[PDB]
Design a protein around this ligand. Structure first.
Ligand SMILES: [Zn+2]
Lengths: 146, 1126, 98, 113, 98
C-alpha cells in the first residue's frame, strides 16, 4: 500500500474529504407521475440529510455550543456521509417508509441491479420486433417471410 | 349410476366398480373457511368426526389472547363469542360496483375492573370481514381472488442424523421446531460434546442446560445409567452447579448483562414455559406427543414446551445413538426409535384458507392488544369503557393488506372453468413462511412415495416453479390438524370390505396397502395368492393375500383433476402428460362448444363443481325460459329466477356466457344443470372441438411440430373465439382546475368525433380501431405560461384561450371491435369513487378472433403446435367419400416423444364417430368377453368414456376397429388397422400407401399470435437511462443482451454492433440525426458516445474518483461538448 | 472525435472536486410546493445545475433562443440547452472534514 | 394531497424483472430541435409582420402586450401612455386584427394555429 | 507439453463420450490463455515481489534484458491457472468491475 502511494501520482490526502459532490439532478430525477403523486430517487433523501446536518453544524459552531454538542454533530455528519456513499456498509442501513433500505450512491454500481451488471444485461435497441415463427418450405435458403 | 339426473349417458369401458364417489372437488377451500367463521355446518360435521369440544378459527384467536392484563392485575379485558351478520350486498352487486363482498363482525368484550369490581360488557364492531362466496372465491375490491393453500414444515421434533466422512461416525441431531420461539438443536459431535445451540449460539454441552433445569446429579446418573456415552460426557463436563449453569446460560444467551440468578430464571421461564413468547400450535403438540409418546392419552393442551419433553428428547437422542430400535419413556407408551424425513407427507402439513387468515388476524389482534394495553396503563381508570379501549385500525389494516398484497392471494385465473377449479386446488410451496426458490434445494422438488393419493405427481408447472406447486388428488381430504388424508377400504381377513377409513401418511406406514387393479372375486376373495403391494417406505413386493391390511378405492386415486381427464393416460410418458395437464388449463372458450367424443368420466363432475354452470336448487317445472333468465316453479309454490350473465369479461380477457339448455314446460330435478357456462356442453367440460386428423408428413408445411388446418375451420367458425378488452379513464381534480369529460376537443375534425356521443364517450355498437377516441377528456392548462405571440394570436382572431389540453382515452395500438358496453361511475350520484376523482368511465370493446397462422393448438396428450398453414378445403387430402381431413399432424413427432396415447385416442375416436356393431350372432367374440353387455352396439356420433388407468385395452380397440358400421354409401372407409386410402388434394392421385385417420380432440391454447406481435421504428424513450420504451403507443424495443453481442463479435461485425448499441439505443443526437438522414436521402452519419458511458462517468466521479479519458500524449479529453445544429 | 487510447481512474483531491463543480449547494430544499420550480441555491437550483426548460431563464427576460450563451443578471441561470442539466455538477462544502 | 409522502422510484414495481419504477418513467419532453425551429419561425414572423404594420401600432402591440418588457398594458393604461382614451384601444386592436388577416401577413401566419 | 496433452485429451474425452465433437484448436485456444504465466521464487534484482505470478512476455524478455545490463536473473518456473484467476490477474478494471 505504501509503495502504491509512493508512486505519488495522487497524495494520500484524498482519503479525507472537504467537499462532497452532488450528481446532476437528471440522474436522480424528481418526477410527478400521473395521479398527482410525487416520486423521487433515494439520492435526494440522502443528500438532504448531509446538507441539513452540515448547515446545522455551521450554525452550531458559530453559536459556540459546548464540546459535546459539536462532537455529536460532527459524528452525525460523518455518519450521513457514510450512508450517502454506501448504505448498509456499516451498521443498520437507513430504511425507507416500508423498512426498505435506501439505494445509496454506490448501490448504482454494485449487485445485480448496477451500472456494470446492467451493461452486461444489454441495452434495449430500436428498429426491432418479435413474433411467432412458422416453418415455410417455399422459401430459398436466403429468405425469410415477414 | 349417474349422480346428476340430467347427465348425457356416455357408455364407459370401466371394468372395476368404484365404491366411493368423488368428493366435492372444491371442499378443500370451503371447509377451511367454514371452520374459520365457526359456521353451524362445520360444527355439525365436527360432531361426526369425533371432536367433543370443537372450536372455530376466530373463537380460538381471540379466546387464547384473552384475558389481557395491565401488568398489575387491577384491570383486565376479555372478549369472546364472535358473530357475523348478513352480507352487505350480494356477489353480483359487489362485482359490478367494485365493492368488497364482506360481512361485519361483532364480538362481546367485557371489562372487569378488579379493584372496584363493577363490570361493563357490550358488543364491539370489529370490521367488515371479507366473506367467501359459494364457489370458494374472495371478491376483494371487485376482483375474484383465490388464496392457494400452502405447504409448510410441521412444527415438532425431527431426529435428523448425518454420517461423518473423515471419521465415518454417525452424528445425530434433533432440532425442535416450534411455531414461534427459539431453536434447541441437541447435536452430538465426534468430540462427544453433546451440546445445546439455543438460537444458534455457541455450542454448550447439554449437561449444563440440564443442570440449569435443576436436575440433580444422582437423578441424572440413575436415569441415564444405561447410556455409556451419557456417563462419559457427564464425567467429562467441566462446568457444574445449577446456579453456575443458569448463569452461564444467561451469559451465553444475553452476554454483557448483569449475571443475576433471578434474571436467568426469568429468561428460562420466558423461553420454555411462557405461553406467548414460545408457542407451538395444537398440531405441533400432537406431533411431539406422538413422536415421544408423552401424555398420549391427554388431550391437546398447554402448547408451550414442557421440561418432561426435553428430557424425553435427550433420552431419545442418546438411545438412538446407542442403536436401540425401541424405547419407552416412563409414564408413556413405547415408541419406535428411527430417523425422520421432512419431505415425508407425515411431516409436511397443509394450512388452508382458515389457517392463513387466522394468522393474519392473530397479528392484527397482537398489535391491537398492544395498543389497548398502552391505553389501559395510561388512560383514566374511573370512566374507561371498552369502546374507548378496543381499536379496530390494526385489524382492518392487517386483513386488507393480506388480501391486497400477500403472495397467497392471487388473481383467480378464469381462462376456462378447469383453470379456475385447478387454481383453488393448488398446493403452493413457496411464499412467506415457506422455502424460497433459491433456498429450495433439488431434494424438495422431487417426488416421494408418500404423494400417492395426497398430491398428484404429474401436474405441476413446467417452468422454474417445478415441484414447488402441485394439486390435491381427486379423493384427497384434509384432516383438521392439516395433514392430507386419503381414503382406503380395509380388509378384515383377506376379503375386501365396503366401508372405508381415511388414513394419513403416519398411519399408512404401519399398515400394508394393496392396489386397486388387483383382481378380486365377486365375494371379495383375492383370486391370486400374492398381490402387488406398497410397503413401508416406497417398497413394493408381493405378499401373501392374508397379510394385506388396506386396499385402494379406485385406480384414479393418484391423479389430479386436470390429469384425470386425459384419455389413455396409461400410455403416455410423465413429461407429455405433464404438458397435457398444464395445457388444458390454457384452453380458450370458443363460440360453440362440443363435448369430446372420447373422454374420461371426470368431464361431467369437474364442470358441475367448477361453478360455471347454474344448477337448479330444487325440483320444479320451468314456467318460462329466456336468453337472459330462467324461472323454475318449485313444488312448494315458491318462484325462483336464475339470472345468468351474458358476454361478461373474465379476469384474463376471455368471455363468459351461460345459454340455457332446458325448455319451457320441462320438469327438472334438483341438482340438474340448467345452463352451460363457457367451455361446457350439456353440463360436461368441453374445452375444444373434434377434428378429422390424418397423421402423415405433408409437403413440409407441418415440419417439426407445426400444424396444417383445413379452411373449413376458419369459414365455419369451428375454432372462433371472443375476447373482451376493458379500457378505463378517470377525471380527477387538478391544482389548475377540474378535469371534465366532454365532446369538445381543441382542433379536431368532426369526422374523428363522429362516433362520440353527447356525453363525450363513444356510443354502444360503434366499431373502433387502433387510434380512435373512446372518451373525450379535456384537462385544464389555464395557469400555464402563455407565449406573448400566442396570446396575441388569441386576441387577433378572438380565438378562445382554450388552455385545456386533451388527454383523451384512445384505443391502444392493435385493438378493435365493437363496443359491447360502457359503465360510468360519477361522484355526483355518490358512487363511492376513489378520493380525488369525479368521473370514471370504463369502456368494454369486444373482438371476435378467428384462427390464423401463429395460433397454438394442442391435443390432450401434450402434442403442441403452431398453425403453419391454412390450406383451402380442396387442397386437403380427402377420404374416398369426399370428406376432406380437417387437420394434419406430422408422424415424426409421435414415436420420438413417446405419447402413443394420441394414436389410440384417434382410433377410438373414429370408432366412436362411425358407430360399431359387434358380431353377436355367434356369441361374444373372445376379445369382447370383458366388454359391458351394453357396449356391444353404438350409434354414429356416440360418446364413449375410458377412465384413466382402467379403460379400453389394446385387444378391445383392435376388435372395435374391425366392427365399425359402414358409411351411408355402404362402404367401410378405414380398414382393420385403422388406416385409410387418401386422395391427394393437388395431384389428385391416391397416396401409394394407406394413412391413419380419425377424430382427435383439439383445443385452442391462449398463446395467440395477435398478442405476440411488436414493431418499433421510433417511439417514446426513458427518462433516467434514455432507452426505448412505450406502453402500446410504440411497442418498445427488444433487448440486445450480452449473448447477442458475443455473436456479433464472433462474426467480426464491428460496424453493425456499434449501430445496435450507440446510434439507435442511447446516442441522443445520433438518434435525431439518423432519423433525419433516413427520411431524407443523406447517408446515415457516424455514431457518437453512448449516453450509458457518460452516465457511468458522471456517476463514478460523484464517489470522489477522478476519472479522465486520456488521449495520445497523456492529455485528458474534455468529454463535455456542445454544438448547435442549424 | 473518438480516440480514447487509455482511461485513468485516480483519487479525487478536494481541489479537483471544486474544479468540477459549477457552484455550491447550500440549502436542503428541493422544489417549491406551489410553483413546482427548483428553489434558489437548493438541491435542484437552476443557477448551479442548469435551466429547466430549453432556452428559459427563470425570469422570462431571455425566453427566446435569440439570446443564448448569456448569463442573466436577474437570476444567473445560463440560457442554454436543457439537457445540460444532465452533466453539470455541484459540491457541498463541509464544515468538518470526513 | 399535501400530506402525501412521495413514493420512491427505486421501489421495484410488480416484481417486473426487478425493474425500479423509475425505469418506466417516460421522459416524453425536451425536443430541443423542434422547439428552436418553431420559436425562431413564429417569433421572427410576428416581429416582421408587426414591422410591416404601422410602427406606432407595433409599439402599441409591444406595450399593450409586453413583447419586450411584459406588463400587458390595459386599454386605459396604454391610452394614458399614448395620451389616448380607453375606448380608442378597442378600435386600434380591431384595425390590427383586420390588417393581420389580409395580404402577405396571412400567407406567413396561416400556420402556427 | 504433457499437461497440455492431458487437458485436451480429458476435455475431448468428455465431449466425445457424450456424442458431440469439436475440433481441438477450440480447446487449445483456451489452455493457451490458461497456461501463459510463470511463477517466481526469489527476486534478487527484480522489482516485483517474490511469489508474484508474471507472464512470459513480461518476465522472460525483461529478465533476459536485465541480465544483459548485469542484473542477476530471477528464478521462475511454469505455473498453471484457472479460467477465473487468469482473467482476474490481467483483466482491466473496467472488465473486472462486472
Ligand atoms: Zn433571468
Amino acid at each position: 500500500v505504501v509503495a502504491a502511494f509512493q508512486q505519488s501520482g495522487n497524495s494520500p490526502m484524498g482519503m479525507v474529504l472537504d467537499a462532497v459532490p452532488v450528481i446532476p439532478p437528471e440522474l436522480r430525477p424528481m418526477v410527478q407521475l400521473d395521479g398527482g403523486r410525487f416520486a423521487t430517487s433515494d439520492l435526494n433523501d440522502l443528500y438532504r440529510r448531509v446538507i441539513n446536518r452540515n448547515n446545522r453544524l455551521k450554525r452550531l459552531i458559530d453559536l459556540g455550543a459546548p464540546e459535546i454538542i459539536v462532537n455529536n454533530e460532527k459524528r452525525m455528519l460523518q455518519e450521513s456521509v457514510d450512508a450517502l456513499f454506501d448504505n448498509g456498509r456499516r451498521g443498520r442501513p437507513v430504511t425507507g417508509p416500508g423498512n426498505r433500505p435506501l439505494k445509496s450512491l454506490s448501490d448504482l454500481l454494485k449487485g445485480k441491479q448496477g451500472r456494470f451488471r446492467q451493461n452486461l444485461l444489454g441495452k434495449r435497441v430500436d428498429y426491432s420486433g418479435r413474433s411467432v415463427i412458422v416453418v415455410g418450405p417455399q422459401l430459398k435458403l436466403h429468405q425469410c417471410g415477414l | 349410476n349417474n349422480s346428476v339426473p340430467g347427465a348425457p349417458n356416455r357408455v364407459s369401458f370401466a371394468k372395476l366398480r368404484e365404491p366411493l364417489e368423488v368428493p366435492g372437488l372444491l371442499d378443500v377451500q370451503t371447509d377451511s373457511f367454514e371452520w374459520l367463521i365457526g359456521s353451524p355446518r362445520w360444527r355439525e360435521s365436527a360432531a361426526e368426526r369425533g371432536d367433543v369440544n370443537p372450536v372455530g378459527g376466530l373463537e380460538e384467536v381471540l379466546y387464547e389472547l384473552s384475558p389481557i392484563e395491565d401488568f398489575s392485575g387491577s384491570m383486565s379485558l376479555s372478549f369472546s363469542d364472535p358473530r357475523f351478520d348478513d352480507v352487505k350486498a350480494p356477489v353480483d352487486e359487489c362485482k359490478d360496483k367494485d365493492m368488497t363482498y364482506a360481512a361485519p363482525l361483532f364480538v362481546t368484550a367485557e371489562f372487569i375492573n378488579n379493584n372496584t369490581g363493577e363490570i361493563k360488557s357490550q358488543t364491539v364492531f370489529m370490521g367488515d370481514f371479507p366473506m367467501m362466496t359459494e364457489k370458494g372465491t374472495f371478491i376483494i375490491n371487485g376482483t375474484e381472488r383465490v388464496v392457494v393453500s400452502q405447504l409448510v414444515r410441521s412444527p415438532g421434533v425431527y431426529f435428523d442424523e448425518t454420517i461423518d466422512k473423515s471419521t465415518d461416525k454417525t452424528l445425530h441431531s434433533v432440532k425442535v421446531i416450534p411455531s414461534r420461539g427459539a431453536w434447541l438443536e441437541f447435536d452430538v459431535d465426534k468430540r462427544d460434546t453433546v451440546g445445546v445451540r439455543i438460537d444458534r449460539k455457541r455450542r454448550q454441552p447439554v449437561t449444563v442446560l440440564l443442570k440449569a433445569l435443576g436436575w440433580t446429579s444422582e437423578q441424572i446418573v440413575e436415569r441415564f445409567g444405561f447410556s455409556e456415552i451419557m456417563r462419559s460426557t457427564l464425567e467429562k463436563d467441566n462446568t457444574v452447579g445449577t446456579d453456575e449453569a443458569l448463569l452461564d446460560i444467561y451469559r451465553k444467551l444475553r452476554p454483557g448483562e448483569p449475571p443475576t440468578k433471578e434474571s436467568a430464571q426469568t429468561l428460562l421461564e420466558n423461553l420454555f414455559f411462557k405461553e406467548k413468547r414460545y408457542d407451538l400450535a395444537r398440531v405441533g403438540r400432537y406431533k411431539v406427543n406422538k413422536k415421544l409418546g408423552l401424555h398420549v392419552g391427554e388431550p391437546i393442551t398447554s402448547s408451550t414446551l414442557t421440561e418432561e419433553d426435553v428430557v424425553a428428547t435427550i433420552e431419545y437422542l442418546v438411545r438412538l445413538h446407542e442403536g436401540q430400535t425401541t424405547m419407552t419413556v416412563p409414564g408413556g407408551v413405547e415408541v419406535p426409535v428411527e430417523t425422520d424425513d421432512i419431505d415425508h407427507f407425515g411431516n409436511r402439513r397443509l394450512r388452508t384458507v382458515g389457517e392463513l387468515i387466522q394468522n393474519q388476524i392473530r397479528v392484527g389482534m397482537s398489535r391491537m392488544e398492544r395498543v389497548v394495553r398502552e391505553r389501559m396503563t395510561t388512560q383514566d381508570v374511573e370512566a374507561i369503557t371498552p369502546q374507548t379501549l378496543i381499536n379496530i385500525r390494526p385489524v382492518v389494516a392487517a386483513i386488507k393488506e393480506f388480501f391486497g398484497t400477500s403472495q397467497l392471494s392471487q388473481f383467480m385465473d378464469q381462462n376456462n372453468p378447469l383453470s379456475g377449479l385447478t387454481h383453488k386446488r393448488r398446493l403452493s410451496a413457496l411464499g412467506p413462511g415457506g422455502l424460497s426458490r433459491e433456498r429450495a434445494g433439488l431434494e424438495v422438488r422431487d417426488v416421494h412415495p408418500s404423494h400417492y393419493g395426497r398430491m398428484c405427481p404429474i401436474e405441476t408447472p413446467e417452468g422454474p416453479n417445478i415441484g414447488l406447486i402441485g394439486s390435491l388428488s381427486v379423493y384427497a381430504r384434509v384432516n383438521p390438524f392439516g395433514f392430507i388424508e386419503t381414503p382406503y377400504r380395509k380388509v378384515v381377513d383377506g376379503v375386501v370390505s365396503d366401508e372405508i377409513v381415511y388414513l394419513t401418511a403416519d398411519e399408512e406406514d404401519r399398515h400394508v396397502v394393496a392396489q386397486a387393479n388387483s383382481p378380486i372375486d365377486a365375494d371379495g376373495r383375492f383370486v391370486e395368492p400374492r398381490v402387488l403391494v406398497r410397503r413401508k417406505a416406497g417398497e413394493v413386493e408381493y405378499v401373501p393375500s392374508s397379510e394385506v391390511d388396506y386396499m385402494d378405492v379406485s385406480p384414479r386415486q393418484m391423479v389430479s383433476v386436470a390429469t384425470a381427464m386425459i384419455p389413455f393416460l396409461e400410455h403416455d410418458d410423465a413429461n407429455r402428460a405433464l404438458m397435457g395437464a398444464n395445457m388444458q388449463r390454457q384452453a380458450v372458450p370458443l363460440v360453440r362448444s362440443e363435448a369430446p367424443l372420447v373422454g374420461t368420466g371426470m368431464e361431467l363432475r369437474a364442470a358441475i363443481d367448477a361453478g360455471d354452470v347454474v344448477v337448479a336448487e330444487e325440483s320444479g317445472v320451468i314456467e318460462e325460459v329466456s336468453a337472459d333468465y330462467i324461472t323454475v316453479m318449485h313444488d312448494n309454490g315458491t318462484r325462483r329466477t336464475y339470472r345468468m350473465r351474458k358476454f361478461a369479461r373474465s379476469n384474463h380477457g376471455t368471455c363468459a356466457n351461460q345459454c340455457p339448455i332446458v325448455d319451457a314446460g320441462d320438469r327438472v330435478e334438483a341438482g340438474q344443470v340448467i345452463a352451460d357456462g363457457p367451455c361446457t356442453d350439456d353440463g360436461e367440460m368441453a374445452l375444444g372441438k373434434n377434428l378429422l386428423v390424418a397423421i402423415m408428413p405433408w409437403e413440409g408445411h407441418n415440419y417439426e411440430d407445426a400444424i396444417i388446418l383445413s379452411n373449413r375451420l376458419v369459414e365455419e367458425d369451428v375454432l372462433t373465439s371472443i375476447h373482451i378488452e376493458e379500457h378505463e379513464i378517470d377525471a380527477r381534480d387538478t391544482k389548475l382546475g377540474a378535469e371534465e369529460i366532454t365532446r369538445d376537443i381543441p382542433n379536431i375534425s368532426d369526422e374523428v368525433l363522429a362516433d362520440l356521443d353527447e356525453r363525450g364517450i363513444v356510443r354502444i355498437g360503434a366499431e373502433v380501431r387502433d387510434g380512435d377516441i373512446l372518451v373525450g377528456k379535456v384537462t385544464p392548462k389555464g395557469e400555464t405560461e402563455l407565449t406573448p405571440e400566442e396570446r396575441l394570436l388569441r386576441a387577433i382572431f378572438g380565438e378562445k384561450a382554450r388552455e385545456v389540453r386533451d388527454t383523451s382515452l384512445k384505443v391502444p395500438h392493435g385493438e378493435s371491435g365493437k363496443v359491447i358496453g360502457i359503465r360510468v361511475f360519477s361522484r355526483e350520484d355518490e358512487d363511492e369513487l376513489p378520493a380525488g376523482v369525479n368521473e370514471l368511465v370504463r369502456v368494454y370493446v369486444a373482438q371476435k378472433r378467428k384462427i390464423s397462422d401463429g395460433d397454438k393448438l394442442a391435443g390432450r396428450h401434450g402434442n403442441k403446435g403452431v398453425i403453419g398453414k391454412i390450406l383451402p378445403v380442396e387442397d386437403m387430402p380427402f377420404l374416398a367419400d369426399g370428406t376432406p381431413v380437417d387437420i394434419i399432424l406430422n408422424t415424426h413427432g409421435v414415436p420420438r416423444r413417446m405419447n402413443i396415447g394420441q394414436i389410440l385416442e384417434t382410433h377410438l375416436g373414429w370408432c366412436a364417430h362411425s358407430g360399431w356393431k359387434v358380431d353377436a350372432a355367434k356369441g361374444v367374440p373372445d376379445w369382447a368377453a370383458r366388454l359391458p353387455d351394453e357396449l356391444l352396439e353404438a350409434q354414429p356420433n356416440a360418446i364413449v368414456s375410458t377412465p384413466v388407468f382402467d379403460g379400453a385395452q389394446e385387444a378391445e380397440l383392435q376388435g372395435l376397429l374391425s366392427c365399425t358400421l359402414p358409411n351411408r354409401d355402404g362402404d367401410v372407409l378405414v380398414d382393420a388397422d385403422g388406416k385409410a386410402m387418401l386422395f391427394d388434394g393437388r395431384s389428385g392421385e391416391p397416396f401409394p400407401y394407406p394413412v391413419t385417420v380419425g377424430y382427435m380432440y383439439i383445443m385452442k391454447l391462449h398463446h395467440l399470435v395477435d398478442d405476440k406481435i411488436h414493431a418499433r421504428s421510433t417511439g417514446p424513450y426513458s427518462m433516467i437511462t434514455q432507452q426505448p420504451l412505450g406502453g402500446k403507443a410504440q411497442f418498445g424495443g427488444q433487448r440486445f443482451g450480452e449473448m447477442e453481442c458475443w455473436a456479433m463479435q464472433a462474426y467480426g461485425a464491428a460496424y453493425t454492433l456499434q449501430e445496435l448499441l450507440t446510434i439507435k439505443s442511447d446516442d441522443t443526437v445520433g438518434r435525431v440525426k439518423v432519423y433525419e438522414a433516413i427520411v431524407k436521402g443523406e447517408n446515415i452519419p457516424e455514431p457518437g458516445i453512448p449516453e450509458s458511458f457518460k452516465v457511468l462517468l458522471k456517476e463514478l466521479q460523484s464517489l470522489c474518483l477522478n476519472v479522465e479519458v486520456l488521449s495520445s500524449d497523456g492529455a485528458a479529453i474534455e468529454l463535455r461538448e456542445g454544438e448547435d445544429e442549424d | 472525435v473518438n480516440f480514447f487510447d487509455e482511461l485513468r481512474i485516480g483519487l479525487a483531491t478536494a481541489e479537483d472536486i471544486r474544479q468540477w463543480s459549477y457552484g455550491e449547494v447550500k440549502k436542503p430544499e428541493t422544489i417549491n410546493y406551489r410553483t413546482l420550480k427548483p428553489e434558489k441555491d437548493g438541491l435542484f437550483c437552476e443557477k448551479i445545475f442548469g435551466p429547466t426548460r430549453d432556452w428559459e431563464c427563470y425570469c422570462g427576460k431571455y425566453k427566446r433562443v435569440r439570446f443564448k450563451g448569456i448569463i442573466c443578471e436577474r437570476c444567473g441561470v445560463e440560457v442554454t440547452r436543457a439537457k445540460v442539466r444532465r452533466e453539470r455538477m455541484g459540491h457541498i462544502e463541509l464544515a468538518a472534514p470526513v | 394531497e399535501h400530506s402525501r409522502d412521495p413514493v420512491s422510484l427505486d421501489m421495484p414495481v410488480g416484481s417486473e424483472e426487478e425493474a425500479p419504477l423509475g425505469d418506466f418513467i417516460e421522459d416524453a419532453e425536451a425536443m430541443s430541435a423542434e422547439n428552436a425551429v418553431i420559436a425562431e419561425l413564429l417569433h421572427t414572423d410576428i416581429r416582421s409582420v408587426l414591422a410591416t404594420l404601422d410602427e406606432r401600432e407595433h409599439q402599441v402591440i409591444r406595450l399593450r402586450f409586453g413583447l419586450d418588457d411584459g406588463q400587458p398594458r390595459t386599454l386605459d393604461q396604454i391610452g394614458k401612455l399614448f395620451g389616448l382614451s380607453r375606448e380608442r384601444v378597442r378600435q386600434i386592436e380591431r384595425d390590427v386584427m383586420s390588417k393581420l388577416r389580409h395580404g402577405e401577413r396571412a400567407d406567413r401566419l396561416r400556420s402556427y394555429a | 507439453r504433457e499437461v497440455q496433452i492431458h487437458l485436451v485429451r480429458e476435455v475431448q474425452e468428455v465431449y466425445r463420450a457424450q456424442g458431440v465433437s469439436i475440433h481441438d484448436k477450440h480447446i487449445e485456444v483456451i489452455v493457451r490463455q490458461m497456461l501463459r504465466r510463470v511463477t517466481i521464487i526469489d527476486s534478487g534484482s527484480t522489482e516485483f515481489l517474490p511469489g508474484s505470478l508474471i507472464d512470459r512476455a513480461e518476465f522472460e524478455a525483461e529478465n533476459r534484458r536485465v541480465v544483459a545490463e548485469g542484473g542477476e536473473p530471477a528464478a521462475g518456473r511454469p505455473v498453471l491457472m484457472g479460467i477465473t484467476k487468469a482473467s482476474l490477474a490481467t483483466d482491466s478494471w473496467l472488465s473486472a468491475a462486472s
